[PDB]
Amino acid sequence: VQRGAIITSDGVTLAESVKQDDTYVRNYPHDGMASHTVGYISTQYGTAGIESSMNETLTGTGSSVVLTINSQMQAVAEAALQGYSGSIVVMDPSTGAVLAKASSPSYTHAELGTIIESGTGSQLVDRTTQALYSPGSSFKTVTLAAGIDTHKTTLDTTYSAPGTMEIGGGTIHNYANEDMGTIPLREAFARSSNTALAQLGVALGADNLVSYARAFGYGTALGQDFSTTPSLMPNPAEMTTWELAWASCGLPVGEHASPAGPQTTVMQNAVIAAAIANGGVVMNPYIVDRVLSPEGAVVSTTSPKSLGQAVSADTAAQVREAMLGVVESGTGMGARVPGVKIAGKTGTADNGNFNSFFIGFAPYDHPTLVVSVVIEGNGENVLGYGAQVGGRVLAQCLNIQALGAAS
């Protein structure tokens, strides 16, 4: 039996079964592309990805699986990650379709054995979906959305944003102790003030922060047809005030029975950006576009499915505005690309090294794409790199999407 193929939405075959003049052997053209997603199926080396999760379909002549992944956007994501540990998701904000999904370091089917026998390093980890990180200031997107949706603040409400501040028996600091004095929220957000945003976190309370995070998908195993490990938040009744403050800045510091939080996946970060870009409506991401019978009939198709409306459309619009300012004039100016209006939120989070995040969307006025990035600084300094990569990848992916839409 000839096992079914795995194919991108734009028609590039990534897994196929080739008849020998003698039986069938599994072939991965573009071996190395989208490995964590395609996966594999070996007696010796085990089982992963779509080869595993769609096995009954690929097996039974098998039917073929067409992914949502766009081979061109995927290649772009992959090139952006040459030389780093980290990952990138690109997603259609109105459907939850995953147009690219890249983790680094990665691997080819040809190296698998050697990778596994050696058992050293982390190439098999999918940092889009199976690695949990402190989102840092990227999470303030949520804090802001919730503050606005609950009518606790506005973008023009003023906050004192000093270098340092005492909250709930402990201190909160802006990066490098910068005292920005009294500024409006839109600006504190854009400049990514921890002391400003902490106060809004406190104004919200734990129940609000946690419940809005859950509404964007925390606690849910995101993916209709792929595995994401859930993003974590604490039991709100267990959180201290101080912990609430830092949590709202994207820093998990709780000492309690329930998990510290937030801890996010990059996938979870995309879903937040998507929902904000999609008028507050949260979409459960997916990666299988359709299934082809052995004779090519399109036998099923995955439908987009909402996980709820996390904030009002009004709130979503205010959050988009605030994210525009991040990129036009704030921490995320390295995401700027000439000719396209890009909005987003940056993040940086901590033995000496740290990680750089970015979530964004474009075009500002009628978003059709979303990006989520983490670049792990593994001793190296990668401040502002999340934003660099994100912008660049978004713009490239937009060009590809726009050619595809008119073709």
Ligand X SMILES: *C(=O)[C@@H](NC(C)=O)[C@@H]1NC(C(=O)O)=C(C)CS1
Residues that bind ligand X (CB under 6 A): 136-137, 175, 192, 194, 249-250, 331, 346-349
* Nearest residue (beta carbon) to ligand X: 137
Q: What are phi and psi of 165, to 5 degrees?
A: -160, 140
Least separation in angstroms between CB 400 and ligand X: 28
The tokens 């036998």 sit on which residue?
A: 299
The tokens 């801890």 sit on which residue?
A: 263
| CB closer to ligand X out of 103 and 141 | 141
| CB closer to ligand X out of 75 and 370 | 370
The candidate with the shortest Cα–Cα distance to 286, out of 122, 91, 53, is 91
* Cβ-contact 210, 112 below 8 angstroms: no
| Cα(274)–Cα(216) distance, integer angstroms | 10
| CB closer to ligand X out of 49 and 254 | 254
Least separation in angstroms between CB 194 and ligand X: 5
| CB closer to ligand X out of 45 and 175 | 175
| CB closer to ligand X out of 163 and 168 | 163
CA pseudo-torsion sign 365, 158, 356, 276: negative
Least separation in angstroms between CB 375 and ligand X: 11
Cα dist from 89 to 2, 202, 224, 258, whole Å: 32, 31, 16, 29
Give the CA count within 13 Å in the CB-facing half-sphere of 148: 28
Least separation in angstroms between CB 73 and ligand X: 25
Least separation in angstroms between CB 374 and ligand X: 12
| CB closer to ligand X out of 53 and 355 | 355
103 beta partners: 87
DSSP 191-220: HT-HHHHHHHHHHHHHHHHHHHHHHHTTTS
The candidate with the shortest Cα–Cα distance to 264, out of 275, 255, 272, is 272
